[PDB]
Amino acid sequence: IVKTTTKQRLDAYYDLELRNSVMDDILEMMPESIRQKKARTILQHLSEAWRCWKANIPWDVPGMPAPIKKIIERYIKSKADAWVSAAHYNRERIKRGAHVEKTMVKKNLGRL
Amino acid sequence: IVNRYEKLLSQRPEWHAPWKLSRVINGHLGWVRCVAIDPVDNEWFITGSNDTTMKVWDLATGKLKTTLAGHVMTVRDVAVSDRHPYLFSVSEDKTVKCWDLEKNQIIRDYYGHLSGVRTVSIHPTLDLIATAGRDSVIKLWDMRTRIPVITLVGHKGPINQVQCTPVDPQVVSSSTDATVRLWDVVAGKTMKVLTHHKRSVRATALHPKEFSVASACTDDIRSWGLAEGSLLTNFESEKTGIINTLSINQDDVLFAGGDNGVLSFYDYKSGHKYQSLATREMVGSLEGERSVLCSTFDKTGLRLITGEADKSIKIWKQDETATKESEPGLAWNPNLS
Amino acid sequence: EHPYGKEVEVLMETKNTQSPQTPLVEPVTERTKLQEHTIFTQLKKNIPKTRYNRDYMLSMANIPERIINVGVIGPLHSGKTSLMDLLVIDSHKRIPDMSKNVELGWKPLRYLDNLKQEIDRGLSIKLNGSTLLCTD
Amino acid sequence: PLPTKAEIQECTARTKSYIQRLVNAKLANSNNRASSRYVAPANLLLNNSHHIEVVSKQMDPLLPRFVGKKARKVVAPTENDEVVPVLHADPNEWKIPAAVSNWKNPNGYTENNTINDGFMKLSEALENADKKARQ
Amino acid sequence: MNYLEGVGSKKGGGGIASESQFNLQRRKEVESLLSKGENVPYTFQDEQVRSNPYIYKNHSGKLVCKLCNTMHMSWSSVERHLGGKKHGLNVLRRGISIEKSS
Amino acid sequence: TSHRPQLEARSGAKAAAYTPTGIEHARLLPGHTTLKYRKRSWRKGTAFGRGYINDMTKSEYHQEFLHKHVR
Amino acid sequence: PLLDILVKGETRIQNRVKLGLNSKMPTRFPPAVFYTPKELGGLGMISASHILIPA
RNA sequence: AAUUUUUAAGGUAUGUAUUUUUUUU
RNA sequence: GGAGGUCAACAUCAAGAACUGUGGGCCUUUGCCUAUAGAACUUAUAACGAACAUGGUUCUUGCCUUUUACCAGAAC
Ligand SMILES: Nc1nc2c(ncn2[C@@H]2O[C@H](COP(=O)(O)OP(=O)(O)OP(=O)(O)O)[C@@H](O)[C@H]2O)c(=O)[nH]1
């Protein structure tokens, strides 16, 4: 029973693909030996950084290897672009009068 | 043995011309994940994207023709058929969709992947498709009946890339377990396993003529002869990692795009690196956004198209002046181990 | 602009050219179909065979007094085109455009009304003749 | 070398023949009289003594076909063939911090630049122009 | 169709709890913070090295310094005492009193 | 922590059948069965009288958006 | 356009009540149910939307 | 110059044990 | 041997107005030209059916808390 991606479970899948996509790069950068606890920790830096992007807070960190920071900033700019573009698309869809459901409005106005 | 390595200075490999940037096409709202070109006429190319669309770009003028919607998540890989008027696209939404080009609409969905599918390869002679993804398997689809006929079990990790070849091994696959496997599809089992890579293998390209395959990893770009499966050459690389994309020109030119933005051209026969460039990112971008996520050569082989993480397509043209006035490349030093 | 700046064309592309309906790979068709405009026979092997032997007709073409050119005129639906349809079927041995229905009786065959408009419009638009020999 | 023309015409045929065996068998398995329109003694007993003829009896079209078929899970043992050889400062540079979020503390684990001359110049003009007007 | 609203309830029991119950919860957590999580042991429990080692809890609930024989109402008071000049002295006196014998 | 997703082979080695159990889905019904092969006092009186940035948020199209719908 | 939008609005609210129970049947919901003033126990909604609209 | 009628689901959990004729020292 | 069968199998039934076979000629059998034999069934206010249902995908809509079930037009 492989379940398709639909409206309700879209953004959960977006999360999952993003997290995998970041672990791939950062694990392919680092030299070798130890990952898994380190693997878990890197993702917490990601999500924290996204929260910082939404709040317009800069997200500097004390000593962190620059390349990892490059990676995280790259993916957060991707996610930010998708987030903004959906914010606009749903908004014109609401304006012209088409049916936008309910929590997509309540969710939209937060984005805007 | 080193007496031969004394003679290994007698080859002095194959001068080639330098590559430069001809044109830059903006127009994509996300990253540009994948690029495929019309295999017959070199008239236009197709472009996967983060923003879920596909755009058909006119190749001669770089103008835009039409946009193709239809996926809800990013489009990771794209293939256009030599023998059919079909476009096969694949996404992270677990779906493999055909696109009939004549009418420009969706035709056939192929169902039954567990999770996101990052690669599509069209078998040259059989009217099959090969797709693979985070599911760690390859599925061979009957193109007509949309049946997952053959499932090749194998890699212990997500499969990055899939290729098709007319004779034995018909399926070459490269996963993140650092194994390039060569498949026998009729017996459904692996013909040969190529383990020499240290880390995940994120790119593989097939040579248009020689019948061999190139693989890539962080620091290492190898080649492999098919049939036997032997190692053939190595490609000299300082730490260029991460190698996202490989492409092979008809002229034994081998392009390897990086995640650092550095484009690295090689000579396929020797394993020599005759150039290195760096893209000029964009007006308002970040140094993080300078990189290369895909690539191809058109059928002529004189123009390279690489979509980049800055939401731009860049068409890299080969210089007409060239020769040895001042080409000379990085100049052949065979260092030792 | 300048980051490339000289030999490079940076072009920003929105909208579209080439309206979305265009095939982008055009349907490849060898045969040339005339069936939209007219219903016509384009292959020599399919021309209806004539009992009266055409080459004997070509002999009559020389003698000026032998041939007469006669057009048929009249008001609506007087039978002009269906009159011609008598002479032709009597002249030719087999016709490919005869259905078993128009042969039998029910539907008049109309040889002269070749155009698809004339078939649909139920009418004669453009004049169309035939050249056939017939004995008094 | 390239595979060659006479060889590629071979494996193309033998695979294409094989796949049809899978497509045909798979279409004719599932429940469709509709979709199935797209579709040997075999045994010398042991030492061959008796010989054999095998014939598959026709099942009743109402009763469940594949009466033994029921969907069940199976854990698969590992394949026989074995042992493919693998053939292959910065620790302080690549040492990652520990993530601490302002917005969550689950479970355990407890500006520079100055102003412009624009502001300097504007306020004088308002301070001067006012004193002049107040005189 | 009242699903339009978006509130709900779990089907278990009777929710809010009683203002008195909140205080008990809040005065335990406040004494967990200021205490920095240490378990200050009871006086009768027959001794996990203590952060200090003098503070305890008597058979009643109060906190006591066993050097100074003072009784304290809360952790906040104790940190006043541990930062006091009397609890300074009694350490020095025990300092000398040990340095004169072994 | 998705970590290791799910491998296909364990789902591909199940003893249901080659096909699924035999459930007949509505999108696997035969469709597109055939392939396709390629070949002047008033004027005087007054006192005052007479590039594409790469980003979504700092772009020119974006300010126009919040210039309208945020009113 | 204002008149058109009135006709949509008023029917959309009446539909709000109807879908609120479970019917679109005209027979169940005679106009007295929507239009009687609240003092007699209706909704007392005030109808500007019957009219006839110039076309 | 003419509309159009209704059934399910997201609300009252879920889980465990319970009627048994005494397996040979 | 004929008349039949609410018998069966196999082949065929939307295409340059549209089929095959044959002899000869150019090519050197595909293909082109020419002569000739035979063409049941279905077609022109277009079609096996003087009849008329349902589903799928993608678009544009209608009801509008969400899915099923649905409104009604199009293409495939
Ligand atoms: N009752 C009857 N009807 C006829 C007779 N002859 C022809 N018709 C009908 O009358 C019409 C005339 O046939 P046409 O030959 O197409 O008429 P027409 O002379 O071509 O008319 P034009 O449009 O002017 O060319 C047809 O629809 C025939 O069906 C007849 O002898 N008796």
Ligand SMILES: [Mg+2]
């Ligand atoms: Mg609830």
Ligand SMILES: [Mg+2]
């Ligand atoms: Mg729900």
Ligand SMILES: [Zn+2]
């Ligand atoms: Zn004390």
